[PDB]
Amino acid sequence: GPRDVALGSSIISIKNQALGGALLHSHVQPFPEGSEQQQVTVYGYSDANNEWFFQRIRGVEPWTDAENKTIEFVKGGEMYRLMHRLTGKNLHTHEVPAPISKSEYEVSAYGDVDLGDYKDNWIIEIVEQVGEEDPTLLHPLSTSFRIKNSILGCYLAQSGKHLPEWGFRQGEVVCLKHASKRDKRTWWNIETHENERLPQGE
């Protein structure tokens, strides 16, 4: 994949860095309780349901494919939405107990490019850059980053718990309250990166 992730046109999968860390995932299956919205999980194999792309925050006009004039790069410290590619939904959280980790917040996929709320805005916080590439940008594999909800202030995390059979026993994803900086369940990296507009990164 290309070395720098772009807003909108970069298709990425995102891997958790804790032990047993897997790929951020969504599918057209609802939570049976909680908010009953579309599930978000982690999955262990390559799959089109692992594909996400970055979108502009709620509050400004969104990026669209017809925007051929400009390529913008995702920057540490800035806010973005994360869109599930196949379903078009926003990575979402809210003050709802998580399915298994009842003291944490449930994470779902909700809405679309136009519909949702400001809990779809996440701060991308870069916490480690391997190599001497632009420290402000996201690079596949070498960048570790955290995903902090702009409204609730919690961190996206692979909890370590497994969902029941209704979540195909995939891994629970939560928004951790009071996470430590060095809690690797809240550390993520770009695993795969696809973008036809960018120089390929050999």
**Could you tell me the residue ranges of all domains in the chain?**
11-194
| Resolution, angstroms, 1 dp | 1.9
What's the topology of domain 11-194? Answer: Trefoil (Acidic Fibroblast Growth Factor, subunit A) (2.80.10)
What tokens were used for 71?
């390529």
Question: Which phi and psi (to 5°) does residue 39 adopt?
Answer: -70, 150
DSSP E strands in 31-177: the ranges are: 38-43, 52-55, 79-84, 90-97, 105-110, 122-129, 143-149, 155-162, 171-176
Picking from 186, 185, 37, 32, the residue whose alpha carbon sits closest to that of residue 108 is 37
**Beta-carbon-side half-sphere exposure of residue 60 (alpha carbons within 13 Å):** 10
User: What technique determined this structure?
Assistant: X-ray
- Integer Cα distance of 23 and 32 in angstroms: 22
